[PDB]
Amino acid sequence: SMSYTWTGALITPCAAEESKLPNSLLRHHNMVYATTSRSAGLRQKKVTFDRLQVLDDHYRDVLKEMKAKASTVKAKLLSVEEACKLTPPHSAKSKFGYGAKDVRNLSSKAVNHIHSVWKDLLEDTVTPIDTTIMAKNEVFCVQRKPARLIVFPDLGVRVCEKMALYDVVSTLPQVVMGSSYGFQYSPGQRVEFLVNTWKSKKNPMGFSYDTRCFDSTVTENDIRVEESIYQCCDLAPEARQAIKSLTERLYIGGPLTNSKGQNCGYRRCRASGVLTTSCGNTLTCYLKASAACRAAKLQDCTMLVNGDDLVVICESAGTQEDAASLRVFTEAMTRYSAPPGDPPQPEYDLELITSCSSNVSVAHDASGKRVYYLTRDPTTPLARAAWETARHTPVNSWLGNIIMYAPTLWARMILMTHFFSILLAQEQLEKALDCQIYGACYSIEPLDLPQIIERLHGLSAFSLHSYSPGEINRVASCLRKLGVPPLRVWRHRARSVRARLLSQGGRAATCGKYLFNWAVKTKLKLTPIPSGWFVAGYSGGDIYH
Amino acid sequence: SMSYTWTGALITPCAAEESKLPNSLLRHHNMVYATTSRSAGLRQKKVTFDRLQVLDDHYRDVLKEMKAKASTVKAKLLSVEEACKLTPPHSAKSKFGYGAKDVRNLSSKAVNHIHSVWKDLLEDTVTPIDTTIMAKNEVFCVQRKPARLIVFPDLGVRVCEKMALYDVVSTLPQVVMGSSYGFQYSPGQRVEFLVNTWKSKKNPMGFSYDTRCFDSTVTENDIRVEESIYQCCDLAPEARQAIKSLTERLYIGGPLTNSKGQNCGYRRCRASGVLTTSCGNTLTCYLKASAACRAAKLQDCTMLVNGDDLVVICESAGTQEDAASLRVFTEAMTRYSAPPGDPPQPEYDLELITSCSSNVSVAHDASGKRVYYLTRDPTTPLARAAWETARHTPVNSWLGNIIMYAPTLWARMILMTHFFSILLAQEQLEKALDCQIYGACYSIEPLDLPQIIERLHGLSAFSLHSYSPGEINRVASCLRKLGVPPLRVWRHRARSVRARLLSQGGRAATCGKYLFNWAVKTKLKLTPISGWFVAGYSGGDIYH
Amino acid sequence: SMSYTWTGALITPCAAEESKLPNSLLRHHNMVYATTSRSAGLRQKKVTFDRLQVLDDHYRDVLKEMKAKASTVKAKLLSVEEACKLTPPHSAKSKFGYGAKDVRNLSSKAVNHIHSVWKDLLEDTVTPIDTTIMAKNEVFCVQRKPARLIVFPDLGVRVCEKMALYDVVSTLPQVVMGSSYGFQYSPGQRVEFLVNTWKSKKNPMGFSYDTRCFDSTVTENDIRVEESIYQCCDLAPEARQAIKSLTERLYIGGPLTNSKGQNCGYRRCRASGVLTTSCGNTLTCYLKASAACRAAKLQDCTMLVNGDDLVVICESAGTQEDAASLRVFTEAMTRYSAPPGDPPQPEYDLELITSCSSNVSVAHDASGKRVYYLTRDPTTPLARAAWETARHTPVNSWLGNIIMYAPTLWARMILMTHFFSILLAQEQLEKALDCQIYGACYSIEPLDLPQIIERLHGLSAFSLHSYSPGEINRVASCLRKLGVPPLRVWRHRARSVRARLLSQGGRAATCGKYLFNWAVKTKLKLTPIPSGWFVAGYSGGDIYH
Ligand SMILES: N#C[C@@H](c1ccccc1)N1CCOCC1
Ligand SMILES: N#C[C@H](c1ccccc1)N1CCOCC1
Ligand SMILES: N#C[C@H](c1ccccc1)N1CCOCC1
């Protein structure tokens, strides 16, 4: 069918939308933009087309294999009270007279409506269910991207999605996909996995495969196959009936409605803003790709999947032959409706493989031993931190990034230094902040950062010191490019923060001592001190813990 | 959405379409025409429109109750062997190099292609499945109907439809609509049920509701709802998959390709020529009508549904209040996408209510006792009868009409006397013949008719004798209109046929003795001597 | 025993080998390639391996039956003069100071040497006879093939083989194998056999069986048994004594000597370039398959064998039951050391069965009567055709293909038109040409094709006109893939050649009249224009008539 059809009504904004940035961090303010509903039209062009999908014997085998694992999963029905407790406090309110705050409180009004929505789900497996369609606001750096289209149903239905399916998507993918299921690895765990599966090959080749607007390429067929996988589980028969109802009334497709209530058209592909999107996209991506591997006769593949993001490490057969089999892979995926964005290429050096906008690099600890850590190009993190420090938002990428990339040269020198300067100047070190980790919202005290980092990365995160050349150049140019002070300047700033932190004692002094030992010259001795976080992807799924 | 979209390509025939008749039976040959593909555009016009559909609590309540019943129903997957055996010997061949004969014979080629269609049905629940669109050649009398459009898929698909849904459509409607499922009634049992439910009311009113081109009014929503009722059954897991997939790729709509292989357009409404049409149409009618009854506050409603055909008998609230309530019933049925053709009218006389082109009337048996029988206007039967005698057709509507209308003045005196005459004059009494009964093709030996008619109608079918005045006139009027000899001539022809038959002894002598006892003058004292009326299968490509 | 063992010395070329085309016929010149010695190593990997062979009662029953049939056969020794006459004029020279030209001229130096090779064969039944190993230069279209490994003995030995065994391989296979011996059929007779035996089954099923590099799977045992089948015949005493010597000293194996005189290794399987290779392979293949049929319990098997190529046609026992008996069949062939390449599949459509790279299809003649004929995918003949026009070969596969496939849509419109146009351009219509029919080399005058075709295929061949949808589409997509112009262009090109041919009168007129009556619109009433070619197979046996 067609991924989308449009009525003509605009995708409309909920309020203002600031396209630009109103400085101690970065001087080239004109390189940072937010996407807006103004670029919506362009996105609608890039994301709408017909979908011709040709399956083959490889697709069916993998699927059979996947169904066999899915059949050993038992999963439970979440109560109204449990599914309420999972809704964020600022989730988008219902059009039926209650908000997320009512839900969280178990108000008998919300709860009665949730009951009613579930009962209709049980009673009617046909009528499409309404979604809202909005354009995302994300900050990026110049050299432009159109806004991405978020699509999601009413809060009533989302609490119902939780009840039917939260336990399935928290549990199944890991079993179905084993070590290929990305969202079970902390950053350190993901480096240990990739590094070890690299050295396990006689002669390793790796590639990341970029799919071209993946949610568009997900066919309604893909989504029923995904349902049959869910249905293999040992389910309660009432969950079984809402999982059917949901996939046919919501996941497969539906109408699109803008913020002003007008009808914008119709979707017959993946909505980003529903509970099954991460799990669904992950499964679908691993299915097609496993098959593409088999089609291209690739040797001893190990895969790692996170939603629409795929990496494959395998046994090379030579540069000529690798490059050719990679094009055979690409056809396989195309035939499966997962065509290429940037066409994929063989890498023979782990460091240069990018997956989940991240890559492996090495550095050394206090004792000199080489340590491998996860990193990324810091442009977007810096840009967003700049945006975050200028315009107050209730979402904190900087903090997520400090947690996720704590060992990195840039997170420690720039991000840690910068914001600990702000919190200290504003007397708000104590105050909890909300950050995203695998699409899930957690409330986090910035003063706990030392424990958190020790726990996810070991003490070495506090003492890494001979970063690789290619990493050091990456960061330096990013800094020159953005107009952020060179690294010598942040060392001097960090010493200032470290000292101010130490004078406050306790948790505050432990941040200074640990997060900033890299800046002192004479190091102190850093000793041990004294998480269902890295288990499953929930991005798009309206989750809070 | 639009029931049909047309590309502009014509609807094409396979062959020569006779339209006019090329005299024993009727003399006014120019009154009888046969529909052809020349009339198709006029039909295309009538059957293509937008459907605005809107449901309410009544609809929804009735659906809940319907599902509850379906849930009590086990149904099983037919094997390829069982499904092959159900295929008519003369069913349109597959475009994949085999025919019904190959199917019927378990040709491993036919069987292996069926296995391949089944497997694709399982992997793929979205790609529309190709149908072929044809204009129907039906025969009529004047005062002019344009051809109906038959729409159907390839034989491979059809066998898969049987594997998946033959047990459901043969079993689900009766459980779900109890006394309303019309196809559980032989013609004698249909009459009994109408008469008793009429007599059981304190003060009865009735109406039949003519839906304007029902097939086109069936929305893609209606067809999915039907699919969801089926799924309430306890079904094998491979059946469940083949049903959804069949409904999404076939039932719900898909491309229309003519006989020359060109795209005519796209369908988003009921297909006339699939296994589920009768069942679907019946359920979908029962659902809309049951709720419409509630919307109109109809007291003590009893209903009879045969696909798109509907009859309601209920308690009267007074003349005035009935008409008003009928108009409410119509309003509802319109919201639900079943606007009327001829708007419904209240009737206080059962013998004036028409349903499945038929009506109850009354006659008296040997003893004097009054018996109720089903009749109709004989115009179309006599038309097709004459057409069947001039041009050899593989279908025999005369036999079916003798079977379904054995007790009628017109079938007894004309159809029996005419064709038993012809059969005699060609030494073909032994030869089995193919006739349709609730859409299914059965082979029947005409010499068996006495045992069959007794079983289906009773001994009294061989001695009904004081037909109502209205009935006698309709028959006689129609005789004058069509130019077919009056009933006194047929009486004479019958004594002659009866004699010849009596002289052959055997089964032939029993036909003589029983089928034409009406004609003798001095009667003989007549003494005594299946699984046919259980479910509907028009469109379904079915044989036993 | 290892099919081959290798010293390490390479397989080397005689002249320098083209691998690429230097366009009237096809634009996509980079899709056409020739195999060269560059790929000898890739082949070497594929064809060298160990043979576990195990036999059973079914194998023995069938061998017994075979020897009984062969015991009814007489066969005579060929004179030297007879044997010399069968030697093609461009057959590789002897390394004992004479050539094929000398052989054909009955020179006393050649004849004296042939007597001495014979005298030594009679006396010595053990000393392995020298062979020469070479890489074959065959043309193909992409979608890569390593070259095949042609291996052959000295010309002296070859003339001796013809003396001993020519009469035997020309006559024995037929008697032994009966209706199964494939090389006894014209292409039209093969078509009639496949068709009639298909229609002779109540409920038919067929399969072809591809054997993983058959020459390599032939064990020394097989080649000895094969020998013992020959010894059943009534044979002159010296025929017997030479047949044993040849089978122990040359057929069983022996050393491999490259074109430079070095030792490449040693062979313990079938040699492609000896006289008994067609007859042996056909027997061995027939013997194993006949037994496997019985192992699998196939009902009413009708078998057709051409060397390593096998098709079986039998009564279907149902689909699951059919699928299973092939697996049983495959297991048996494997025990017997003839494992599969592509595993066999059941087929219920005669036109979808390929055998000898060919399938049956249907057209209609002058009268509209339906008529059966033999065809193939034209990709490979089109490719070899391109090549034979761009570069001068002494082997004209285009002429082979016109004779073999006169009735075909693609042969008539493209091969006929195209080559008759070139012969016309170059004033060479009168000039005899060498072509290979069943591996025997014939010199054929191209103006004789209208008689040759009438005899071999009937007048229907000159007027077939409603080729099946499947056959039309295969020919169409091949034109596109290969870049050859569409059939409308060949119609017009054919009318031109047809006119020019009619103007010359004589036999040139007759070709234009008949061969091209398809391009004319108003046709001529074609009427009758006023062989020992399809008896046995000699592919590999150095044979000329
Ligand atoms: N940073 C970050 C996370 C991530 C964040 C949000 C959604 C999905 C992933 N990222 C690193 C670990 O592997 C996955 C990619
Ligand atoms: N009542 C009833 C049946 C019937 C038969 C077939 C389809 C629907 C109804 N009856 C009317 C028309 O044909 C024969 C007599
Ligand atoms: N059947 C047959 C022959 C054949 C010829 C030569 C060797 C084996 C088989 N066929 C395919 C290849 O050449 C011409 C047509």
Numbering used by the authors:
A (entry chain A), C (entry chain C): 1 to 22, 28 to 148, 154 to 540, 548 to 562
B (entry chain B): 1 to 22, 28 to 148, 154 to 539, 548 to 562
Give the text the authors published on this PDB structure.
In this study, we presented a ligand-observed MS approach for high-throughput screen of a 384-member fragment library as well as reliable estimation of binding affinity of each fragment hit. This approach was integrated into a FBLD program targeting the RNA polymerase of Hepatitis C virus (HCV), NS5B, which is a particularly attractive target for anti-HCV drug development. Similar to other nucleotide polymerases, the domain distribution of apo HCV NS5B polymerase bears an anatomical resemblance to a right hand with subdomains representing the fingers, thumb and palm. Structural and mechanistic studies of NS5B have indicated the existence of multiple allosteric binding domains including palm I, II and III pockets and thumb I and II sites targeted by reported inhibitors. The proposed discovery pipeline combining our MS-based approach and other biophysical techniques resulted in identification and validation of ten new fragments bound to two distinctive domains of NS5B, among which five were successfully translated to X-ray structures of fragment-bound complexes valuable for structure-based design of potent inhibitors.
To characterize the binding modes of the fragments studied, they were soaked in NS5B crystals to obtain the protein complex X-ray structures. Inspection of the crystal structures indicated that fragments 114, 204, 117, and 328 all bound at the palm I allosteric domain, while fragment 162 bound at the thumb region. Fragment 117 binds at the pocket mainly through van der Waals interactions with Met414, Cys366 and Ser368, whereas fragment 328 forms van der Waals interactions with Tyr415 and Cys366. We assume these weak interactions may result in the lower binding strengths observed for the two fragments. For fragment 328 showing SPR response below the typical threshold for positive binding, its affinity were estimated to be 20 mM by the MS-based analysis, suggesting the latter may be more sensitive in capturing very weak interactions. In this study, four fragment hits and the designed ligands all bound in the palm I pocket, where an overwhelming majority of NS5B inhibitors were also found to bind Specifically, Met414, Cys366 and Tyr448 in the palm domain of NS5B have been documented to be the “hot spots” for binding of high-potency inhibitors3854 and they were also found to be the dominant sites for fragment binding in our study.
